[PDB]
């Protein structure tokens, strides 16, 4: 069943700067104390990424449509995990194959079918009175499925769902790419207790799983949790989206096989010099 939300506040999107974030292992090769350089799809250092706010204030909501470039970097700041899942496709009207990934209190679903999506897909969790528990009472993301190719159910995941207004408890970083009919997802989960201005430091994104699909993807749309207790209690969750470009990076593997540093070879000419000598320290002279 398809519905829509009314009486919502609209706000312009903001911009924020990526402070050397978005590094992931491009290969499955172990290295020890090496300065290997590679040219792949990456997120350039020190650039705008757009910022959408899902604050409850008054009655503000956000769920826009963003085109899918060659790669997507999704950085969510969460306290009670309001954000749940994503949908990928071109038309999103059951006329073409489309992917849907959700991880709810029930079993995790990764399903590439034809779904008749609604104008405002969402998930609705009700705060019942007979027991003080939150259970999913509204599945209105799409109408129905017709005929499919690849459906997968992962292990069930249990996580408390509440509408809170506190500081973000954790950060979830995801990188989505689509090459050679393969959908590759790189995931990382980190703890922090900040409010904005994403922390410094380098955090490599380990790969999670690869999905063989082989479909066009030019548009993606995320979905939230619409709690019930008219009223929706959207919370104050935040998520950032960024796009990837072909860039050459210099990676420094430690003794354990874990990436600890990287240098973008498109920044100020000092970075170019560091990218030529294959070292992080350059002495005086002319190069």
């Amino acid at each position: 069943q398809c519905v829509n939300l009314t009486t919502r506040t609209q706000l312009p999107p903001a911009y924020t700067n990526s402070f050397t974030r978005g590094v992931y292992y491009p290969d499955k090769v172990f290295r020890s104390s090496v300065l290997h350089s590679t040219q792949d799809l990456f997120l350039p250092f020190f650039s705008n990424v757009t910022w959408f706010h899902a604050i409850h204030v008054t009655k503000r909501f956000d769920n826009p449509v963003l085109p899918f470039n060659d790669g997507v970097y999704f950085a969510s700041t969460e306290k009670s995990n309001i954000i749940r899942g994503w949908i990928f496709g071109t038309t999103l009207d059951s006329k073409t194959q489309s992917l849907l990934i959700v991880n709810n209190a029930t079993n995790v679903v990764i399903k590439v079918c034809e779904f008749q999506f609604c104008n405002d897909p969402f998930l609705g969790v009700y705060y019942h009175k007979n027991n003080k528990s939150w259970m999913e009472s509204e599945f209105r993301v799409y109408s129905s499925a017709n005929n499919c190719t690849f459906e997968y159910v992962s292990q069930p995941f249990l996580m408390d769902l509440e509408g809170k207004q506190g500081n973000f408890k954790n950060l979830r970083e995801f990188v989505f790419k689509n090459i050679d009919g393969y959908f590759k997802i790189y995931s990382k989960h980190t703890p922090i207790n900040l409010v904005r201005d994403l922390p410094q430091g380098f955090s490599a994104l380990e790969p999670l799983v690869d999905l063989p699909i082989g479909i066009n993807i030019t548009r993606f749309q995320t979905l939230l949790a619409l709690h019930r207790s008219s009223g929706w209690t959207a919370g104050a969750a935040a998520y950032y989206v960024g796009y990837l470009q072909p860039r050459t990076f210099l990676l420094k593997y430690n003794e354990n096989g874990t990436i600890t540093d990287a240098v973008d070879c498109a920044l100020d000419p000092l970075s170019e010099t560091k990218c030529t000598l294959k070292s992080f320290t350059v002495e005086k002279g002319i190069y």
């Binding site: 090769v29 172990f30 393969y182 082989g214 354990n256 096989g257 874990t258």
Partner: protein
């Protein structure tokens, strides 16, 4: 300096991933409830590595009928999708499963096109089929007014009218009637001895093609210059035990020279080592042929 010296490999260990998970396709072949020829069954199965040597040596299959595809090479082939079916064909109509025929249900029910690989196999059915009295629930086509085409479905849930007489709930002399029943005669010849048949179709199209076949795995050897054929990697060397700590997802191992030197075991998840096996140059030492005729060899 005289020549060079090299050590040849002996074994060809071919270790692959651990185990195939499952493929319930055999269950599709081996259930208890099935429809008739009127049901153009089409069961699509993908992302499943399935055993094929079982069908070549099974219990009561016998009538193995594949078309112009080599029988042996298809077990170790990898495709994108497979299709299934099940119904009763009444003995001699085994001839109708051919690449192009129109005499009978070869085109009436479960139409098969020409140049369609579709390995087909049937078996004798004397207890499930040819039952006592006759289970007339099964139906076969009367005339097939659908006028099918290669790879089409004949679904005629209505009745004929020739040119004059409507037959909408009225006994029409020219309106004929729906599909005739199935004469499961108790004990008779091939003309009254039904058979149950199943077809396995293949199609590649353009996809990642994650429907592969089973692969073997030989035991490993250590401390011996042998030929190794790990997943993707093919080479020669001596495999021993190392002490490097790998990440829970990395599989390969490289160095500054970008040459593979450590392989993770796909079965037991153990980190090995790679080293060339004792190549060198041989040289002789002589005190001068005038004084004596003795030599010493330096390796």
């Amino acid at each position: 300096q005289t020549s060079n010296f090299r050590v040849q490999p002996t074994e060809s260990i071919v270790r692959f991933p651990n185990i195939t998970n499952l493929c319930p396709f055999g269950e599709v072949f081996n259930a208890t409830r099935f429809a008739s020829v009127y049901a153009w069954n089409r069961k699509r199965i993908s992302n499943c590595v399935a055993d094929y040597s079982v069908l070549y040596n099974s219990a009561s299959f016998s009538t193995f009928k594949c078309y112009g595809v080599s029988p042996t090479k298809l077990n170790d082939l990898c495709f994108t999708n497979v299709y299934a079916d099940s119904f009763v064909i009444r003995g001699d109509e085994v001839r109708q499963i051919a690449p192009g025929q129109t005499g009978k249900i070869a085109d009436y029910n479960y139409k098969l096109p020409d140049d369609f690989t579709g390995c087909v196999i049937a078996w004798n059915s004397n207890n499930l089929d040819s039952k006592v009295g006759g289970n007339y629930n099964y139906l076969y086509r009367l005339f097939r007014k659908s006028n099918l085409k290669p790879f089409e479905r004949d679904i005629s849930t209505e009745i004929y009218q020739a040119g004059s007489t409507p037959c909408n709930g009225v006994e029409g002399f020219n309106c004929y009637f729906p599909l005739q029943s199935y004469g499961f005669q108790p004990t008779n010849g091939v003309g009254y001895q039904p058979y149950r048949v199943v077809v396995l179709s293949f199609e590649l199209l353009h996809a990642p093609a994650t429907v592969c076949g089973p692969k073997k795995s030989t035991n490993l050897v250590k401390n011996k210059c042998v030929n190794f054929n790990f997943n993707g990697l093919t080479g020669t060397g001596v495999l021993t035990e190392s002490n490097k700590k790998f990440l829970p997802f990395q599989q390969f191992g490289r160095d500054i020279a970008d040459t593979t030197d450590a392989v993770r075991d796909p079965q037991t998840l153990e980190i090995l080592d790679i080293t060339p096996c004792s190549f060198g140059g041989v040289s002789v030492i002589t005190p001068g042929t005038n004084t004596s005729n003795q030599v010493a060899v330096l390796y």
